[PDB]
């Protein structure tokens, strides 16, 4: 997050690896549920 590479985004970035041990179909339900496709277009708050 702007000269950091050690912020909260990086905190879970590691453990996040566990996400790979989850059904690909289930993840799709949660993704399309909120529609992260547009949430990745803009972020600032």
């Amino acid at each position: 997050g702007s000269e950091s590479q050690n912020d909260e985004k990086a905190l879970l970035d590691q453990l996040d690896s566990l996400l790979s041990s989850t059904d690909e179909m289930e993840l799709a339900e949660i993704d399309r549920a909120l529609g992260i496709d547009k949430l990745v277009s803009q972020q600032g708050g």
């Binding site: 912020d7 996400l19 339900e29």
Partner: protein, 50 residues
């Protein structure tokens, strides 16, 4: 200078908390509630279709 926020940790902390697969339902909603975490998380989550 190296110190992450406390608010962001709260959001991610949810999906990180060792709970049953049911509570996972809350994670999804949390993902959106997480900014910097959304982009990063998307890497693994969004990867569901990668």
């Amino acid at each position: 200078g190296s110190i992450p926020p406390n608010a962001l940790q709260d959001l991610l902390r949810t999906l990180r908390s060792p709970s049953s697969p049911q509570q996972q339902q809350q994670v999804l909603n949390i993902l959106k509630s997480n900014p910097q975490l959304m982009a990063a998380f998307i890497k693994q989550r969004a990867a569901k279709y990668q």
